Design a binder for this molecule. Structure first.
Ligand SMILES: O=[N+]([O-])c1ccc([C@H]2CO2)cc1
Length: 318
């Protein structure tokens, strides 16, 4: 951990916290919601140890990275803009890419816009968001699960923030991190309530120490949730702006990995997309699909060594 270097860089008009360790080919790690660079701590240690330059930023709006006030400053294009400037600062032609959750959606955009900068992509949890020309991303979600589905509830400015404020930052973070209930997260009406997890454990699961949860809390206490939530608030706008890529394919070699109990895997007809041919058709060089039994959404933390191995083995192929 100590050997993990922390710096602040100027990228795409913002100041970004980058955590770094190691030397060798760059592995760029993109975290998700509601996480931080810390989410990758085990992978940063492992990959650095194994002869790679591990790079894990706090994305725009998270942690120690600048958080622009405008909701519209949170399109996929803004975030990829940040990452392309970062990659230039690293002074390399290509990176290996590893991404989870919202970080993975941004990863898909990076691969869409600049496949030639990504040598291989280890994608966790969220597979490519297929652009259906007939229905916007969040509309499809609302049709399927109605208004209290979490993404839907995330859309209105300031609301989810106040609800989360009411139950407390630590409650929210524990509530989400500990969830193992499959299926669509549907909230109780008008409040956070049990949120993503109606069955919170008394003690943290063995992959998450009190110091880990405390780190997350210490940053979210400071930044709040606005920036991270803003990502979801641009999903329809992202659907509009990505029209030029409608019907396109991703050429970057991909290894997809998900926990079997991931709410993502277990909803939105994801299984059908992932396994039924659609994912492979959008992404012709999808080489492997790994489902981790008895592993929840946060698979890079819950199954850290296993993911470390899957990443190492995959990138060393090249
Ligand atoms: O609660 N989670 O485990 C969780 C966290 C983050 C996301 C991103 C896709 O919206 C979904 C679910």
């Amino acid at each position: 951990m100590e050997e993990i270097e922390h710096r602040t860089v100027e990228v795409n008009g913002i100041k970004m916290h980058v955590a770094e360790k190691g030397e060798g080919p760059v592995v760029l790690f993109l975290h998700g919601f509601p996480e931080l660079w810390y989410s990758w701590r085990h992978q940063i240690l492992a990959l650095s140890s194994r002869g790679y330059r591990a790079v894990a930023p706090d994305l725009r709006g998270y942690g120690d990275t600048e958080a622009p006030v405008s909701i519209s400053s949170y399109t996929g294009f803004h975030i990829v803009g940040d990452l392309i400037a970062l990659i230039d600062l690293l002074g390399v032609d290509q990176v290996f890419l590893v991404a989870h959750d919202w970080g993975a959606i941004i990863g898909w955009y990076l691969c869409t816009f600049h496949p030639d900068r990504v040598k291989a992509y280890v994608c966790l949890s969220v597979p490519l968001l297929h652009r259906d020309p007939n229905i916007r991303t969040v509309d499809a979600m609302r049709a399927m699960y109605g208004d209290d589905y979490y993404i839907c509830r995330f859309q209105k400015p300031g609301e989810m923030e106040a609800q989360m404020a009411e139950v407390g930052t630590e409650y929210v973070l524990k509530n989400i991190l500990t969830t193992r209930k499959p299926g669509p997260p549907i909230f109780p009406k008008g409040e956070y309530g049990t949120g993503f997890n109606p069955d919170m454990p008394n003690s943290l699961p063995s992959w998450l120490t009190q110091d880990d949860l405390a780190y997350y809390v210490s940053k979210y206490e400071k930044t709040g949730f606005t920036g991270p939530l803003n990502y979801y608030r641009n999903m329809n706008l992202n659907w509009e702006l990505t029209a030029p890529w409608s019907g396109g394919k991703i050429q970057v070699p991909v290894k997809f990995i998900t926990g079997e109990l991931d709410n993502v895997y277990t909803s939105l007809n994801m299984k059908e997309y992932i396994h039924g041919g659609g994912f492979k058709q959008d992404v012709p060089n999808l080489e492997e699909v790994i489902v981790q039994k008895n592993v929840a959404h946060f698979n890079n933390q819950e199954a850290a060594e296993e993911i470390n191995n899957h990443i190492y083995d995959f990138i060393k192929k090249f």
